[PDB]
């Protein structure tokens, strides 16, 4: 996890890499924030019954 | 002549990202990164 060089020499296995194109890892994206809404309820359940 | 070349993250389909879902994936051995070598080198084959 230094440099993407060598995250691709984790993903071939060797330490001597060809010339060429190869796959990492996925780009993923973390969410910064997380909303939450509900209704505009104000009643209590009657849950003494 | 060709296909239409596609790639799939195995973890991604299966695992939508979920801690508890990937850490069991992983004890089932490489079954991800062969799925992603037969896509990938089936996508260099259409160009060729």
Do not use: H, W
Not at chain 1, 7 to 13: N, R
């Amino acid at each position: 996890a230094l440099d993407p060089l060598s995250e691709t020499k984790c993903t071939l296995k060797s330490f001597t890499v060809e010339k060429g194109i190869y796959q990492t890892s996925n780009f993923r994206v973390q969410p910064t924030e997380s909303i939450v809404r509900f209704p505009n309820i104000t009643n209590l359940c009657p849950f003494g019954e | 002549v060709s296909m239409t070349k596609t790639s799939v993250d195995c973890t991604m389909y299966i695992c939508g990202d979920s801690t508890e879902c990937s850490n069991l994936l992983l004890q089932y051995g490489s079954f991800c990164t062969q799925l992603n070598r037969a896509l990938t080198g089936i996508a260099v084959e259409q160009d060729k």
